[PDB]
Structure 1
Amino acid sequence: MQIFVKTLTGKTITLEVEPSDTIENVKAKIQDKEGIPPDQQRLIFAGKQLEDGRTLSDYNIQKESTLHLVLRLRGG
C-alpha cells in the first residue's frame, strides 16, 4: 500500500509498504530512495515516534496515511 513521508524542505517521499512491515524496514526503503541511514532517522505519526520493533498496523497506519521524518541529531 501507499503511504507518504513528509519531510524537511517540503519533500514528499512515496513508499509502497505492507502493514506487516517493521518500522525498521520503512526506514530501510526510505534509505534506498533517499540515501539516508536508517539509525539517523525517526518517523512520527499522529505526532508520535514509532519504535522500529513495532509495525505500522499496530499503530493502525492505514493506506494513504501521512508520516513525517525527523532526522536524528548529527553528533548526536
Structure 2
Amino acid sequence: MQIFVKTLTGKTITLEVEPSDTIENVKAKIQDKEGIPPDQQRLIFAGKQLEDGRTLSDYNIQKESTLHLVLRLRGG
C-alpha cells in the first residue's frame, strides 16, 4: 500500500508502507526520501498525534490514507 503525507506547505509526500510498519518506521522513510530527521517530525491522522511505537494498522491507516506532517521548531 501507499499512504500520503500532507504538509502545511502545499506538498504531498507519497510513501510505500505496509500495515504493520510502526510510526517510527514511517518517519525513517520520510527521512530517507525527504531528508527530514525523525526528531523534527510530528505526524497526525484523524485528529490524533501518532506515537512512534504503534503501527499504521493500530490507527486504522489504510491504502491511500492521508497523514499530516507538522514540524517542530528549535531555535538558538
TM-score over 0.5 (shorter chain)? yes
Provide the C-alpha distance between the structure 1 equivalents of 2:45 and 2:62, rounded to a whole number of angstroms.
Answer: 11
Partner SS, residue 25 of structure 1: helix
Q: What secondary structure is seen at the aligned counterpart in 2 of 1:9?
A: coil
Q: Secondary structure at the match of 1:8?
A: coil
Give the drift of 1:18. 0.5
Matched positions, count: 76
Structure 2 gap segments, 5+ residues each: none
Q: Secondary structure at the match of 2:62?
A: coil
Unaligned runs of 5+ in 1: none
TM-score normalised to the size of structure 1? 0.93
Percent of residue pairs identical: 100
Distance in structure 1 (CA, Å) of the matches to 2:8 and 2:40: 14
Partners of 1:35 and 1:46 in 2: how far apart? 25
- CA deviations on 1:23-61 (whole Å, 9 max, x unpaired) are 001000101111000011010001211100000101111
Give TM-score, length-normalised by structure 2.
0.93
